[PDB]
Amino acid sequence: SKGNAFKHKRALVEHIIQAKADAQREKALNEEAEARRLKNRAARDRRAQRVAEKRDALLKEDA
Amino acid sequence: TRSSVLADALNAINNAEKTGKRQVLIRPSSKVIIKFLQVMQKHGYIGEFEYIDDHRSGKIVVQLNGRLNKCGVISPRFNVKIGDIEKWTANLLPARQFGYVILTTSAGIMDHEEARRKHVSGKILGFVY
Amino acid sequence: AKRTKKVGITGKYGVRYGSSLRRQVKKLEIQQHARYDCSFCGKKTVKRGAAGIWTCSCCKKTVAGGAYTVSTAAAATVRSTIRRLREMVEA
Amino acid sequence: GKGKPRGLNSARKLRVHRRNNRWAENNYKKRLLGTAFKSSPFGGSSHAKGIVLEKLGIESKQPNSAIRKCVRVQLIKNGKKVTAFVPNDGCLNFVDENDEVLLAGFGRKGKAKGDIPGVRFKVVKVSGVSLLALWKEKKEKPRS
Amino acid sequence: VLVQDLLHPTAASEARKHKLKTLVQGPRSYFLDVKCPGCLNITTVFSHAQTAVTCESCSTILCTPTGGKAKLSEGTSFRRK
Amino acid sequence: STELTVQSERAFQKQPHIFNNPKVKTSKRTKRWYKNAGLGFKTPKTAIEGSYIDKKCPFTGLVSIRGKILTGTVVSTKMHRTIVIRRAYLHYIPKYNRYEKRHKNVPVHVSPAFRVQVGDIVTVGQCRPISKTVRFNVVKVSAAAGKANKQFAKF
Amino acid sequence: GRMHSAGKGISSSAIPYSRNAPAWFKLSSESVIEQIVKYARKGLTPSQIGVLLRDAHGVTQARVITGNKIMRILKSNGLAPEIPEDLYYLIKKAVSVRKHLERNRKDKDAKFRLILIESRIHRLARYYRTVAVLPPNWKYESATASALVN
RNA sequence: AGGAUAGUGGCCUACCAUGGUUUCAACGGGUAACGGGGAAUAAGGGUUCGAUUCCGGAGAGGGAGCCUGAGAAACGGCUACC
RNA sequence: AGGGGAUCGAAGAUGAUCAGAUACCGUCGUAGUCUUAACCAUAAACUAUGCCGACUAGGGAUCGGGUGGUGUUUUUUUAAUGACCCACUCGGCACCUUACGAGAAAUCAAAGUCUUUGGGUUCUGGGGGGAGUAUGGUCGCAAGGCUGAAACUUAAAGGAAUUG
């Protein structure tokens, strides 16, 4: 605003509205991508210790 | 830096035969080089050659039977039509009867002789006589 | 924008007084009006009060310096050679 | 090597490079700048009429020594005051001032031939009659 | 000499050629086994260690980096592997 | 498509020579006229159920794609319902037996049916002259990734 | 080589022909992977991880010992750096030289080195922003670069 | 969006937005430039010329306008200015 | 422009030589030579040899790094450790003999792998002058730089070697 390109109050408010929505779409993907990184890789990381050394290897082929 | 491996390959073979060395080392020997040597080898200009298979594109040892005179490249690979190939042979070969002009084609890499018989053309890798 | 190609601070003089004279003042005037680093608080706040008086906006230490610079080249080398003389007396 | 782009898609550079180096010619520069049409006594012609204004005794160059019997002819088509050689023996008695003569080139596209300084033309006809015929006395130059 | 078998050069020539100029480039570097005499821990030491590595037991310098093959300690036992 | 203030101009934009009678009320309550562009160019769905008008659209508009079909990348998308594509190719100089990369910037009219971006390859089709400099409409966005799916930033 | 020098040294590493763990190896793939991560939890370069592996243990080359190559596993394990390494130390090198010039005005030799270091930075960045490890328009601003390398 | 046209179209008019082309040469200038089929030379590759027997364009001293007509901005049609 | 300004030293004064000698030589001496801040941006800026890549011939030297040596040398006489040596090795500056090869030759180990012509690429030249001139543009405080003709003039200009 000390530089030009905010010709009036409405121009500043409409720029803030755009910038806020731009960051709030940015934050929408930020939480969404952060969700998958926490979810998809990590949730089945316990599946390895769960099933990989559980079935088809130790119990059925034991007697 | 290195731009055409076959260019350096046949430039190395040319220097080898000129000095008369019966064997030469070629690298890094892409498969266009092997196909090129197959064309020459079956015709008898070169004899035995070994493709040392390391994981760095490999190297080639060629046995020169003292029969090759000059094998060159025509860079860039000019797109030659089925008709202009005779103009290319007449410009590049010491005589009509012998010598070969190597073309990579839809049907593979072969000399200008069976390029006519296959009735296929393409680019010009080089020549051998 | 880039308001002047070469005159810069001397542009206040308009067209008069000759280009060479205006060039000489343009050199000494940017050097006179620049903020300078302070030797006691370490922040670029030393301004020129009067010719030869260099007052820091903070810590209010005024240094006696050159007319158009905090430290002249001559004063700098004199300080060095006075130090050279005092090192041989003290060592 | 060879200092020229042999790459398959280098056609643009080849043509531009050749098109700049064609300016180092003499003939091509003359043809493209039209120096015959612009700065030449003949506007790209082979022959041009004119008026013999006076006679010049043009001393030859070394090692020769002779008077070359040229004529100061001003060309009707552009007024240029050029000097024209007069071949064959005599033939300066055959022509006088305020005649009309047909000039031709001198055999070297400029660059006066022989031991003649600064004369790049030779007179072919005079009074509409061939100076060759006059030399052989077949015809007679009319007094017109 | 116009004739020699590049496929089968003498092993001395292989040892007398640069580590990458040879028929198939292979590392002239190897590995070591270093026991600190005061302790009972063995550790794999690269021939060009490049670092002053200490055994996992105690902060004792068992080798010293240098230009090529890193220097080994005087008071230690090295075993080629 | 089905949003974005379609009726934002002065005159009422509507496909001409159609009407939706208020006498009969149906389930859809609306009628939008579209068509297949042709030449195996299956109509994008957003045109089928769209709300924009774009009289010059190959699908929802009155223009027919007859003539040639071009293909090229997009270099500018910064006009209303029209972009400029750069159809780079090779010209064969016969003397030097060599090619040169010569390009033509082709401007084309995009219907809002396609989300077209810079870099993404598109195919266009000749039509009746849309404007002074446009004669082609985007008819399919050639997109496996479109130089955007794996080359643009992920937050 | 040395696109900013006339030197043509060939020094490098000539990895062996064998594409498998040597006979004398002891640790398992998980054991080396778990050893790599904690080295990186210290805040370590995959280049430093590889060299420290080669010395502390007999991990000749981590990509051979594991099924996956070093920085590959780190990004899968969630330690992916914000910007690529070789770019990063170019950035740190650039700011090192740049602060050197502010104090040293008449170091013309270092001034020339600066544009060579930046030339390297920009060509690396141009390549990276195609592979998209760097977001597009990621620019070496040369102003707040020191914020990126601290 | 309309007007105009035989119709398309900034072709024109209103409103709207800032677009368009460019070192892959835009734009500007020159042309002793009408374009092409072709002509001369020609080992091949090419070079130069192509006003000129055919196709296409433009013109009827120079611009401009228009009537008739299917077809003209016609000129062995007209009107005006030079 | 500021400081600095010992020596040397354009210009200049000068005393000599010379037919003349405001040239060589001698004495002095200004700008400059030095530095900081700005310029200029050219040099026989030359290896008169663009840059990158490979291959082709032998050698001994040397510089920097690396490797091997129950090699010599040093307070203690394999016992505390660098330098030297031999053999290699990469990179560097080059050097010598021969030229297979190349070149007009001189010569070149690249100036070779080019009429058996094509590894990639940038720049430049097209007889000599006129002329790096005019003009125009552009950068410079200026000196000038970069870019850059033509008319006209000429049958040579030139290179390398041979004999005298």
Short mmCIF file of C-alpha atoms (C1' of nucleotides) in Angstrom, two decimals, chain I residues 63-141:
data_model
loop_
_atom_site.label_atom_id
_atom_site.label_comp_id
_atom_site.label_asym_id
_atom_site.label_seq_id
_atom_site.Cartn_x
_atom_site.Cartn_y
_atom_site.Cartn_z
"C1'" C I 63 55.49 -29.95 -11.00
"C1'" G I 64 51.02 -31.42 -7.77
"C1'" G I 65 48.39 -35.70 -5.74
"C1'" G I 66 47.94 -41.08 -5.07
"C1'" U I 67 50.14 -46.43 -4.80
"C1'" G I 68 53.97 -50.42 -3.84
"C1'" G I 69 58.74 -51.18 -1.78
"C1'" U I 70 61.04 -56.09 5.51
"C1'" G I 71 64.67 -49.40 -0.53
"C1'" U I 72 68.96 -44.95 1.63
"C1'" U I 73 69.09 -41.04 5.13
"C1'" U I 74 68.75 -38.72 9.67
"C1'" U I 75 68.39 -37.91 18.75
"C1'" U I 76 68.00 -43.97 20.03
"C1'" U I 77 72.53 -47.04 14.61
"C1'" U I 78 65.59 -52.98 12.20
"C1'" A I 79 63.19 -48.80 18.54
"C1'" A I 80 60.35 -42.53 18.08
"C1'" U I 81 59.75 -41.13 11.18
"C1'" G I 82 60.35 -36.25 6.70
"C1'" A I 83 63.07 -35.95 2.62
"C1'" C I 84 65.45 -38.82 -1.22
"C1'" C I 85 65.38 -43.47 -4.51
"C1'" C I 86 63.14 -47.29 -7.85
"C1'" A I 87 58.68 -48.89 -10.17
"C1'" C I 88 54.06 -47.29 -11.45
"C1'" U I 89 49.74 -43.77 -11.94
"C1'" C I 90 46.35 -39.43 -12.91
"C1'" G I 91 46.53 -34.31 -14.12
"C1'" G I 92 50.01 -29.99 -15.79
"C1'" C I 93 53.90 -26.98 -18.12
"C1'" A I 94 56.66 -28.25 -21.71
"C1'" C I 95 60.95 -30.82 -24.06
"C1'" C I 96 63.76 -34.40 -27.49
"C1'" U I 97 64.00 -38.25 -32.08
"C1'" U I 98 61.34 -39.80 -36.14
"C1'" A I 99 57.85 -38.21 -39.13
"C1'" C I 100 53.92 -43.27 -40.91
"C1'" G I 101 50.72 -38.64 -41.68
"C1'" A I 102 50.11 -33.49 -42.89
"C1'" G I 103 51.74 -29.07 -45.10
"C1'" A I 104 53.45 -24.38 -50.26
"C1'" A I 105 57.36 -24.98 -47.42
"C1'" A I 106 59.34 -23.29 -42.92
"C1'" U I 107 57.87 -26.83 -39.82
"C1'" C I 108 53.86 -29.69 -36.74
"C1'" A I 109 53.21 -35.35 -32.02
"C1'" A I 110 49.34 -31.61 -33.57
"C1'" A I 111 49.38 -27.80 -37.94
"C1'" G I 112 47.82 -35.97 -37.97
"C1'" U I 113 43.29 -39.27 -38.33
"C1'" C I 114 41.07 -33.74 -44.82
"C1'" U I 115 39.77 -35.11 -53.01
"C1'" U I 116 39.82 -42.46 -49.14
"C1'" U I 117 36.98 -35.13 -48.32
"C1'" G I 118 31.20 -35.35 -42.74
"C1'" G I 119 32.77 -36.08 -34.20
"C1'" G I 120 30.01 -31.25 -32.11
"C1'" U I 121 30.02 -26.10 -32.32
"C1'" U I 122 31.16 -20.45 -32.28
"C1'" C I 123 33.80 -16.59 -34.94
"C1'" U I 124 36.41 -14.72 -39.08
"C1'" G I 125 38.63 -14.11 -44.33
"C1'" G I 126 37.59 -13.97 -50.12
"C1'" G I 127 43.70 -9.95 -54.63
"C1'" G I 128 46.05 -5.30 -53.09
"C1'" G I 129 44.86 -0.29 -52.06
"C1'" G I 130 40.87 3.46 -51.12
"C1'" A I 131 40.24 1.98 -45.59
"C1'" G I 132 39.45 0.40 -40.51
"C1'" U I 133 38.53 5.74 -44.18
"C1'" A I 134 33.62 8.17 -45.11
"C1'" U I 135 28.72 7.77 -43.33
"C1'" G I 136 25.19 6.20 -39.72
"C1'" G I 137 24.33 4.05 -35.09
"C1'" U I 138 26.08 2.92 -30.26
"C1'" C I 139 29.32 3.32 -25.67
"C1'" G I 140 33.12 7.14 -23.59
"C1'" C I 141 34.50 13.32 -19.80
#
